[PDB]
Design a binder for this molecule. Structure first.
Ligand SMILES: [Mg+2]
Ligand SMILES: [Mg+2]
Ligand SMILES: [Mg+2]
Ligand SMILES: [Mg+2]
Ligand SMILES: [Mg+2]
Ligand SMILES: [Mg+2]
Ligand SMILES: [Mg+2]
Ligand SMILES: [Mg+2]
Ligand SMILES: [Mg+2]
Ligand SMILES: [Mg+2]
Ligand SMILES: [Mg+2]
Ligand SMILES: [Mg+2]
Ligand SMILES: [Mg+2]
Ligand SMILES: [Mg+2]
Ligand SMILES: [Mg+2]
Ligand SMILES: [Mg+2]
Ligand SMILES: [Mg+2]
Ligand SMILES: [Mg+2]
Ligand SMILES: [Mg+2]
Ligand SMILES: [Mg+2]
Ligand SMILES: [Mg+2]
Ligand SMILES: [Mg+2]
Ligand SMILES: [Mg+2]
Ligand SMILES: [Mg+2]
Ligand SMILES: [Mg+2]
Ligand SMILES: [Mg+2]
Ligand SMILES: [Mg+2]
Ligand SMILES: [Mg+2]
Lengths: 147, 128, 52, 104, 187
RNA sequence: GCCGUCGCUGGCAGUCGGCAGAGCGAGAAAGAGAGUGGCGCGGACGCUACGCCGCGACGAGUAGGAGGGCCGCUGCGGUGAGCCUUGAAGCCUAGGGCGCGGGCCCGGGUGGAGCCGCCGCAGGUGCAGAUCUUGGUGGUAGUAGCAAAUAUUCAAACGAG
RNA sequence: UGGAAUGCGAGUGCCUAGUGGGCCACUUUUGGUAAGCAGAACUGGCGCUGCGGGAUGAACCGAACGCCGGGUUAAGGCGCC
């Protein structure tokens, strides 16, 4: 909406909001990211630190799907199964332990961040974390691997 | 037989003349409509002595008597008969002004109604 | 000139990009062309599966 | 093309347009800068302050029960002074009634 | 003339909400009435919060409302919020709660009602307890927005853990000069 | 005295009426509270709450910023049982007025076919300049000038000349 | 007994235009014979600012501005203009 913009209140003022002493010239600093090392150094150092130089090893033919590994935390682990699976193990008495298959939900690694509810589980996953496996033993449960 | 208002207060206006534009006299391209002069060396917007004046907000009219014609009535454009009944419960404080386009056949049957309704018309002898 | 705080963004508009602009105003006029030829095909193969 | 070289003219007034404010004096100032060995032992002191809790109540509740045998062992002119009493909305309610009844 | 300074004469608080919805502009009418006609500084806070932008009244989580209503003493009270009560899927047990918010997500209505709590509105609250007696005002985290991580001391500055604005994050996106003690310096 | 801005994060849903009882300006934290025993059928205004009302203080301004425009231009969706050959747009006006202003409304004339108010939507949207662009017209001015190369005169004819 | 006086509501956070040629004055002050010169310090101005006075006037004296009525002043004045 032009009728809401700022160039509709700027009709009648000579410099159109841009200065009498210093005009609105075209490119009074160069175009783009020019002068990153010479006359825009205070800005490229106060606001984009580390923008100049190399670091690390190159990797020519990088394919972003060899390193695919989406993780799920223990806090929201019990959200992969339905609700009548977590409560059925509550009402359960024969000690049976529901099998939570994670790679079926779409995660490969299991990281252990949250607390767990006191009931056994059988977590099938591709990769496990040390703590994610200890928080599962400490509640009673098995960490199955699936290639 | 004039249709008096409810109350006719004293109307006082802080200024009567129009606010002419700077240098609207030396030229014909510069109309009389006001434009706040924004030039650097301008003598009008520095408020020099004896120059043209500027429309401050100080010149505002008393709210009690703002928009009020010299007949103690406010006004209303009326495009047809039906827009009078809107005005029949504001009788003694507002008036009617039939539009410029309402032909004389309708304007006669508009002044006719406003006469019964006692609504005052500012241009009742308009077209004929 | 950069402002106070923001991104170092590289716009890829240094070629004559206004010449090779591709607008999709015929997208609704080709969805009907594809659907029409999809039912001319589903009528040419009469009882054979329509997907193929 | 010689230009003015340096000045401080308007500066002492720009400084005061938004005031010159002393820094934000907060309690519990940071512990960055303090020497390592000391700030390493203060952490070992906090890490073990809980170790003497069940012994700390045994004394806080002690001197708080003793607080009982502590405390339960100890346990301009007459005119404008009477007018400033009749003219009290609460304290003068009866000196005012005594006057209202006076005219009967 | 007087030598005052009009730099700060105009206090910038919100006189009214900027939204134009009519189920909020009616709550603001009812609470502007309670705010001026009662001597309870609760209604004044609810009114002053009904003005606030969508970024100043943030969402609450069901879990943060749990742990803020489990604090000793405040039992059988109504948890008032001015934002929305989102769900928190990483909490397994839900008690019964009397709640009053502007919105309750369709998966937090479920949990709260299956628990057995009530979900009032601000008009129901204004009828239950006009002066706001028995309530618990809450508000979600305001510095939770990812925006508040770029604010503060600019990056590339001694001890300024401020997040920079970068197209993407990777090996070769602002990791070279003002970060390595090797290449140049670091702060 | 009036206009406006700011502040009081001020006041007003209490218009609680023969199902009535008309109050919350007053120096002093809190109820014109309940129960428990010793005729005449009457009463202005208000309240588009984005509204209305009351108090004080304040009012310069380039560059720049922000807000409010029931200021204006052109088209679009709605809406005015809108206006119009009993005269639309446009233009002219020593006519009547409104608004601080941007601007606007009436009257008279001219004209001959379309046009506007409101709620939203959109933008190639407001000119005094840019040695601006195109077109038109002035003072200069009945002025400069109609001066290189010797030279014209008389009578007659045609012809309004 | 909120531990001197006087005054006044403060604190904090984003986003941000214009500017980055200045000049004058009292006092101090460096170069220069000096300059309506070149160069610093402090405060106030002009620039961005009208108004009364100084005949006139960027900067001096008074005094800072919504539109008006009455009264009184500042600095300057009161033969005539
Ligand atoms: Mg300006
Ligand atoms: Mg310019
Ligand atoms: Mg600007
Ligand atoms: Mg510039
Ligand atoms: Mg530019
Ligand atoms: Mg260099
Ligand atoms: Mg000039
Ligand atoms: Mg100037
Ligand atoms: Mg800039
Ligand atoms: Mg920016
Ligand atoms: Mg310089
Ligand atoms: Mg003043
Ligand atoms: Mg100011
Ligand atoms: Mg300000
Ligand atoms: Mg002003
Ligand atoms: Mg004329
Ligand atoms: Mg167009
Ligand atoms: Mg022109
Ligand atoms: Mg001649
Ligand atoms: Mg410059
Ligand atoms: Mg000098
Ligand atoms: Mg010089
Ligand atoms: Mg300048
Ligand atoms: Mg200034
Ligand atoms: Mg001055
Ligand atoms: Mg002199
Ligand atoms: Mg006077
Ligand atoms: Mg004199």
């Amino acid at each position: 909406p032009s009728r809401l913009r700022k160039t509709r209140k700027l009709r009648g003022h000579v410099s159109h909001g841009h200065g009498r002493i210093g005009k609105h010239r075209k490119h009074p600093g160069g175009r783009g990211n020019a002068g990153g090392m010479h006359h825009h150094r205070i800005n490229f150092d106060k606001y984009h630190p580390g923008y100049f130089g190399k670091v690390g090893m190159r990797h020519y033919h990088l394919k972003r799907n060899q390193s695919f590994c989406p993780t799920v935390n223990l806090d929201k682990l019990w959200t992969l199964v339905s609700e009548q699976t977590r409560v059925n193990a509550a009402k359960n008495k024969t000690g049976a332990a529901p099998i939570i298959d994670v790679v079926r939900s779409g995660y490969y690694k299991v990281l252990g961040k949250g607390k767990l509810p006191k009931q056994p589980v059988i977590v099938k996953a591709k990769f496990f974390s040390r703590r994610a496996e200890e928080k599962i033993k400490g509640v009673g449960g098995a960490c199955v691997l699936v290639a | 037989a004039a249709l008096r208002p409810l109350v006719k207060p004293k109307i006082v206006k802080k200024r009567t003349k129009k606010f002419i534009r700077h240098q609207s006299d030396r030229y014909v391209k510069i109309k009389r409509n006001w434009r706040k002069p924004r030039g650097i060396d301008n003598r009008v917007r520095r408020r020099f002595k004896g120059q043209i004046l500027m429309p401050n907000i100080g010149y505002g009219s008393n709210k009690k008597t703002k928009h009020m014609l010299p007949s103690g009535f406010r006004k209303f454009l009326v495009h047809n008969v039906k827009e009078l009944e809107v005005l029949l419960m504001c009788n003694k404080s507002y008036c009617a002004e039939i539009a410029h386009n309402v032909s004389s056949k309708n304007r006669k049957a508009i002044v006719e109604r406003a006469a019964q309704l006692a609504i005052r018309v500012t241009n009742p002898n308009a077209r004929l | 000139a950069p402002s106070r705080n923001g991104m170092i963004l590289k716009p890829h508009f240094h070629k004559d990009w206004q010449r090779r602009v591709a607008t999709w105003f015929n997208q609704p006029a080709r969805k009907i062309r594809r659907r029409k030829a999809r039912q001319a095909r589903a009528r040419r193969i009469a009882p054979r599966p329509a997907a193929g | 093309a010689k230009s003015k070289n340096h000045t401080t003219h308007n500066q002492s007034r720009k400084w005061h347009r938004n005031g010159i404010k002393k820094p934000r004096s907060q309690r519990y100032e940071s512990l960055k800068g303090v020497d390592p060995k000391f700030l390493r032992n203060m952490r070992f002191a906090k890490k073990h302050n809980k170790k003497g809790l069940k012994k700390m109540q045994a004394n806080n509740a002690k001197a708080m029960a003793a607080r009982a045998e502590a405390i339960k062992a100890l346990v301009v002119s007459r005119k404008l002074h009477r007018l400033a009493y009749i003219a009290h909305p609460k304290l003068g309610r009866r000196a005012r009634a005594r006057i209202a009844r006076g005219l009967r | 003339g007087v030598d005052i300074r009009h730099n700060k004469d105009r206090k910038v608080r919100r006189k009214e909400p900027k939204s134009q919805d009519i189920y909020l502009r009616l709550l603001v009418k009812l609470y502007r009435f309670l705010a001026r006609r009662t001597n309870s500084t609760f209604n004044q806070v609810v009114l002053k919060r009904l003005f606030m932008s969508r970024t100043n009244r943030p969402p609450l989580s069901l879990s943060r409302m749990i742990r803020k209503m489990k604090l000793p003493g405040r039992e059988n009270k109504t948890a008032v919020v001015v934002g929305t009560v989102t769900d928190d899927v990483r909490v397994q047990e839900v008690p019964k709660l009397k709640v009053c918010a502007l919105r309750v997500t369709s998966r937090a209505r479920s949990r709260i009602l299956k628990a057995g709590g009530k979900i009032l509105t601000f008009d129901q609250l204004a009828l239950d307890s006009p002066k706001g007696r028995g309530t618990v005002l809450l508000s979600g985290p305001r510095k939770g927005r990812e925006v508040y991580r770029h604010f503060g001391k600019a990056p590339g500055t001694p001890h300024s853990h401020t997040k920079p604005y970068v197209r993407s994050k990777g090996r070769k996106f602002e990791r070279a000069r003002g970060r390595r003690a090797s290449r140049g310096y670091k702060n």
